Amino acid sequence: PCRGLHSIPAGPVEFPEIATVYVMCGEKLTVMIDAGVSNSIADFSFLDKLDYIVLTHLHIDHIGLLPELLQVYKAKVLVKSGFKKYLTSEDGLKKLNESAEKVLGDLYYVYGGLEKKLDQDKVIEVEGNEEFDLGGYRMRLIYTPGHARHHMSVLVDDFLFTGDSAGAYFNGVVIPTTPPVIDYKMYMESLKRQIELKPKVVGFAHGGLVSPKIMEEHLKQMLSKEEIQINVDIGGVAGEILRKQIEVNLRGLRESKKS
């Protein structure tokens, strides 16, 4: 059977590592954190069963493979309460894709929009403080708004999976996870709260596993009086995709400070 922790690249074929999906295989429950971009060819066939898929948030790059995953596995999706309708109705999906396209531009087509709504009985709303016994490991959800009103983080023992609430990290460079539009005050509060949890390792949705110290570097980055300007040493299409995303995030950061 499946055991241990699996960190799987779930980005588009042009940049598989831009997004990471985590799977924690406990003795009693198997849980997945996030679900990749719609256009990802990530293969999760190494799983015999899947009990829960926790969505850190509802941005399109974290919920892409749900349609297929919910047909192959008997998994239930856990989402912040009040947002289930965005996944279970045509009008809900239309709004998710609408906001995604407006914010992402060309990246919308790279990652891929949502095309199929999910069955309501497969989606469970949670408050963001629920605890689960995975069997040999303990999981606890944590509501972490700021990046989005529907953002939640996940703590498995001393591993903290932060989604897009505590930064991104590529090639040794800290990138702000601040696309339009973030709630600056809430974002800062959630970031401080997570730093205070003192996890041993952090799992970024964008950048994979990183040291907890990176969260503190991101906090400092958020407090800079000078305009944040980032440059990442990466080439090819992957480099261009990342640069576009960075521009979106820097725009969001600039605008959040004016609020």
CB of 137 to Zn ion, least distance (A): 25
Contact set for Zn ion, span 154-173 (CB under 5 A): 164
Tell me the binding residues for Zn(2+).
57, 59, 61-62, 147, 164, 206
CB of 66 to Zn ion, least distance (A): 15
State the binding string over 114-153 for Zn ion (x if CB under 5 A, else -).
Answer: ----------------------------------------
Q: Which is nearer to Zn ion, 61 or 108 (CB)?
A: 61
Nearest to Zn ion of 60, 141 (CB atom)? 60
Token representation of residue 197: 């949890």
Establish if 34 lies at the interface with Zn ion (CB under 5 A).
no
Closest CA to 29 of 174, 170, 137: 137
Report the residue number, 18 or 25, with the smaller CB distance to Zn ion: 18
Binding residues: 57, 59, 61-62, 147, 164, 206
Shortest distance, CB of residue 206 to Zn ion, whole angstroms?
6
Question: Cβ 19 to Zn ion, closest distance in Å?
Answer: 7
Nearer to Zn ion, 30 or 165 (CB): 165
Q: Tell me the residue length of the chain.
A: 259
59 binds Zn ion (CB under 5 A): yes
From the list 1-9, 53-61, 93-101, 120-128, the region that binds Zn ion by CB under 5 A is 53-61
Write down the least CB distance from residue 116 to Zn ion, Å: 20
DSSP the chain: ---EEEEEE-S-TT-GGGSEEEEEE-SS-EEEE----TT-----TT-S---EEE-S--SGGGTTTHHHHHHHS--EEEEETT-THHHHSHHHHHHHHHHHHHHHTHHHHHH----SPPPGGGEEEE-S--EEE-SSSEEEEEE-TTS-TT-EEEEETTEEEEETSS-EEETTEEE----S---HHHHHHHHHHHHHT--SEEEETTTEEE-THHHHHHHHHHH-SSPP-------HHHHHHHHHHHHHHHHHHHHHHH-
Q: Which is nearer to Zn ion, 10 or 156 (CB)?
A: 10
The reply to whether omega before 103 is within 30° of 0 (cis) is no
Q: Closer CB to Zn ion, residue 61 or residue 153?
A: 61
CB 41 within 8 A of CB 67: no
Q: How far is the CB of 177 from Zn ion (least distance, A)?
A: 6
Of the residues 8, 15, 36, 61, which one makes contact with Zn ion according to CB under 5 A? 61
Binding segment toward Zn ion, per CB under 5 A, in 26-34, 36-44, 52-60, 83-91: 52-60
Footprint of Zn ion (CB under 5 A): 59, 61, 164
